[PDB]
Assembly symmetry: D3
Homo-oligomer: 259 residues x 6
């Protein structure tokens, strides 16, 4: 039976305004979650956090964007390492899902030899040809690898059911990034779980008290949040924002899980 595990690749250090737009220049620290769904029909990694390379050399691997987001993580938090110690070898992952292709969500890309990588086509196309303000957040070393098998979703694919059994669905949430997608999970005991990811960074974004401090479209972003509100209200899902420092310790992590 399927289970959800919440991991993290350490934290990112930045300023408040990078997360809550225009909220000032104070220091601010957020967890970097990523997810594992163990399913009878194959294992699934979502995003996989920051590249394990960031543990030993952020400036080398990420480059000048470390001026904005400084990652704090240990080697053992790298998604491949974390899965091994958990009992899952790289070859044992059937799918990698990508909410989007920003730097702290492409740690899994190409690190699982048989995994099909599912992302919206327009995120993939934007990641390859970004504008100047967002180029720094796309790490080509992660996602620009010719060996990666991609399933690029189209606009009709909103709601894409990974296994065909309502366990994992893509919920398109454009705004934070062009092809950004959220995920709605249904687990046997827990029921519906809504992973907003970066469609709603924090509880304040969810409550319409802040805007994303980094975004492609504000119009899309706020409409995507209200799309998630309606989905939460309809399903009764448990809502997981993408990075909320206050809410994050209140979820089960680590070896603990949702069934």
């Amino acid at each position: 039976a399927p289970r959800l595990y919440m991991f993290q690749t350490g934290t990112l250090k930045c300023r408040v305004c990078n997360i809550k737009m225009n909220a000032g220049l104070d220091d601010y620290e957020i967890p970097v979650p990523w997810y594992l769904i163990t399913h009878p029909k194959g294992n699934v990694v979502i995003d996989g956090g920051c590249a394990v390379e960031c543990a030993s050399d952020p400036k080398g691997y990420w480059g000048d964007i470390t001026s904005v987001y400084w990652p704090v993580m240990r080697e053992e938090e790298g998604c491949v390492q974390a899965l091994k110690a958990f009992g899952i070898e790289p070859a044992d992952v059937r799918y990698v899902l990508h909410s989007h292709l920003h730097l702290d969500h492409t740690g899994a890309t190409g690190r699982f030899p048989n995994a099909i990588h599912i992302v919206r086509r327009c995120e993939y196309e934007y990641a390859m040809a970004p504008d100047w303000f967002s180029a720094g957040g796309y790490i080509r070393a992660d996602f620009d690898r010719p060996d990666v098998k991609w399933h690029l979703l189209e606009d009709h694919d909103d709601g894409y059911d990974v296994f065909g059994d309502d366990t994992i669905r893509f919920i398109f949430t454009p705004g934070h990034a062009p092809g950004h997608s959220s995920f709605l999970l249904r687990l046997p005991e827990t029921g519906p779980v809504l992973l907003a990811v970066d469609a709603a960074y924090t509880t304040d974004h969810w409550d319409e008290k802040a805007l994303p401090g980094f975004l492609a479209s504000t119009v899309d972003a706020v409409r995507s949040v209200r799309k998630l509100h309606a989905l939460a209200e309809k399903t009764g899902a448990l809502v997981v924002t993408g990075h909320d420092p206050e809410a994050w310790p209140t979820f089960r992590h680590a070896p603990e899980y949702y069934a």
Copy 2:
């Protein structure tokens, strides 16, 4: 008389730096609120018209809660109708009102000129009537939602729209800061090309890609619109006029002076 360009202002706006340059801190910041008059043999043209004259006496009553972000400082004589009357132009003597977009500091002219055709992008007019929560406070329905206003709502294929058909005023569509935002390319007999960026490029910093708009509908569109204006300025050699730049603004002639 050959066409001329007159730069007016409706006082200033007081906000924070981050409202203009995204994520740039909460320090106090004050900007001029420019608006433009083009006198033309075939009719006088008002662009936007600045903040409603009502803001000179009761900003909180007329704009409401948004004044905690943008406090307008202006005198009553700076209202666009009053300013034009002092300058020599009666309200009925305006043929066109052009709108870059329909935000609160660009709708002081809407409906104040009884014979003017108001030209704005259709998608701006529609968004102004049905904004999202993050922008609703920047659209003052009392300004632009008036039943007897004649509108010419431009369509997507109307980029480059030529007001008089003589190349002297063209709409340059620049989406991003607002969905239907438009800039203007003017051509004047002596000055030559003048590019009014309006809110496509708040400041010289925005033009130089050292800052993002701290109030916008689409970042992707906004950065691409600035590069579209880079190319136009490089092609035409235009004098580039940013929307609000507090340091550049004193370097331009202001009404009663003009650009020939």
Copy 3:
């Protein structure tokens, strides 16, 4: 309790035949104004809610000049809130208000149920806020332009939207009569499939392609929407309920009777 469908009406509308069947002459014509209640274990659902209860006492004051086309005849007890209270349902006990579209005889419920999420197509909400001259009179801003209404604005890819996730109420997008017009496919335990065409098909004549809507945004869309509903009814075997048909309307059970 298993879900049920209750058919109410807010009296009738008096117009001409040509307003309903395009170009069919200027004879007097009267139609019922139906609206629908779905009682459901997970929450009660109101569809449209008919003409505003205000029309029972002052139609000219509330609707204005459009009453020379559509005169509403209704009693105050037929207002949707009043009718639901008499039937046993307090205004706070409504989870969803669904809107086929936002025309004047389909917005009596908007904002009258303080806890309801209102579900309508985004493009209908936007058109209602910025209509064209030929349709502006059919949209009553006092009904739908209320600040504290919670809206869930459906997108283009939301065709088939399932309200409870259990197949019992689905939006069937049917553009044409209005830009964001939607029909509804209901599934009930005993009755089975019920297709509420609403204004996609005013009458049996419209359904049979012997008449066009005498008030529409797009004929092309409207005829294709009727054929989309033909296919749905053929696939599902649904009971087909037209929007206003004065001859078919007496043949359905009306509240307090219901479809199980």
Copy 4:
């Protein structure tokens, strides 16, 4: 130097409501104009009115649509005949322009052996695959001829300048028909002349006192009329509605012309 000639192929008999939507069932009669622009670089026919075949047998050629529009015309009014007596043989026409492909505007189609026929692509595509309510107004015998040379305009072609000299421009006016187009002419002495064609049947449509009694989209139709208002106000053009029975005798017809 270029000149404009206003011809007509008799009249159509119908009901008021067919022209002014919902205006009642009274009898009503309208002229069917078509246009000739003589230009140094080639002659141009616009639409060409009703098929000459309609003079002798409407029911045979148009079919059941004659229940709605009964054409009253003489053989000699057929655009080919009219041009011959005027001094222009079929081969001497360089372009046929089509506002749209309805029955009373396809009399020229294929009747000029060397003419390129310019129409919006989407009108051509709709004419080939109409819906049930509009099929009767598309006469395939006119426009479905394999020998016809077509230039199908695209959406970017709004404003299409036929000769490249501002003499004749297409002004796209969707609404009455999907690909319906109006024409703005500039003549040396007359100046700007705006042929609305069926974007505004009558002076009442122009003044927003009526809607087209036959249309693909009302939203498009009214916005197309306001597009023409702005164009008339900007240029000072002389406005020619498509069928106005009261205004039609006030224009020059016949051998008379606009220079």
Copy 5:
């Protein structure tokens, strides 16, 4: 009863390799022309129906010049009406005709079944009526341009269209080979999922990205549609049936044998 899938063919087509595998040389090449029958408790379904029976006895007369590209080798008794009659199904007992697209070897069924609703993408029907010169010869108007035919034209948001509403037969939109081309995902009780790629992948080489269609509207759509079907097959474990593969065709069950 449970549904069944039967695979028929209307003989073969002779052409060159390059016609099927773009730019692969001028050697002679021969492919079967499959079509499909699904028996279903709620009605019989014919998919495409192969080449018209009329072209068996006079290819040049019914198809014209295109026969210099595709020579159909086919007996009269392989016509889809004749084959079905022999199989036990009179033309009146077919509820739906599904069209992958409207090319000449997929319109033998059109209008031959008097009561059948024909389901195809709207944009294929519209393209078939107004094709470009390179594709015009591939559309046989005598097959599909019949006014007596009942069509259900699917819109762009109808991808995945479920014919009976029970997951047995779904349209899988696969643009590229033709603008409105569609594949089919079937689900059968014993066999499980069956993916009829039809002309989205002519042969196994196409499936494996070693060839492009030698006749096609959009290469970009075509290759992405093949990858869409890859992901569907990998997700479902479907039996993959290419449209024409001569080496694979003998390995499937053909009527009178079936898939249950």
Copy 6:
């Protein structure tokens, strides 16, 4: 001074007929690789610049596997920087580089001119960065994926883009061969209009609708783009220059000769 057009070539490409004329057989075939210089008072313009100079001396090393389709036969001195230097133009004296598209034989100029603004359709640039498997080998990232390069990316509504604003050089959008492919209409004082079709029509057979492109993104776009150019040539009386025609290429003037 008046503008002039000079026609250069970077040698030839060897391939098969079918590569240029779809499905026309596997015989050997050889085509020139033209590129263009326009001298203009306001600056020099290079169009495409042919095959990269790097591939003259090591084709497999710079182009990789695609050389098994296109073998470039080219001397180092035919590289566009070397040719221009010999002609009298240092790389710093080129104001604009225009790209018909970003295929391997049209990106020899990219980033070789330090001060040049590169003008290409946005959708060609985006496709070149994320191409499909069938086209990936045709895009040489070492040519166009250089961060030092100044791009002006044209939007969909930029068809007809006038480089100097004086009708000398205009982009004529011709999708099909590549998604963002563009042709060029030049106007020169003595010669008059010159239509550079580039890869919208490889050869005269393509122009005459006797062949399809053997490499292409959309056949439908391709054939309609050829007809768009037909109507432009018929309207303007332009000299029509196909992209590669081996029989027509010797009949044009080549550098050092020019068109005035």
